[PDB]
């Protein structure tokens, strides 16, 4: 039997799940903050 590792070194990233959940939050948080801050800056400009 042949065992081929086609895993791109992924196994050497410790605590992978937490690492992927952190990258996801850092991205979704940045998305949702930018959405909210841009919507409020538009509404402020509209009012003034």
């Amino acid at each position: 039997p042949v065992m081929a590792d086609l895993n791109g070194g992924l196994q050497f990233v410790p605590e992978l799940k937490e690492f992927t959940a952190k990258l996801r939050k850092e991205l979704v948080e940045t998305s949702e903050v930018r959405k909210a801050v841009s919507i409020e800056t538009a509404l402020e400009h509209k009012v003034v």
């Binding site: 948080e29 949702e32 903050v33 909210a36 801050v37 409020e40 800056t41 402020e44």
Partner: protein, 71 residues
Amino acid sequence: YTDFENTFQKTVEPVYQMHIKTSKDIAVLRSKEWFQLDDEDFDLLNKTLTFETETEVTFKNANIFSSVKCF
């Protein structure tokens, strides 16, 4: 009367309350220049804030203000 340079209005605003539930709410508040914490590193998360504002206005004409102060 059309002498808008002699007009002015002070309003005591109703007290507004915000429950800061998320870090998005915090970012939206920090995006406002007018929002000025004494301690910039104050932890707003899970806090209830109250805003006790007064608005001083001067008029250019009927619809447009020549000045707005909210403090």
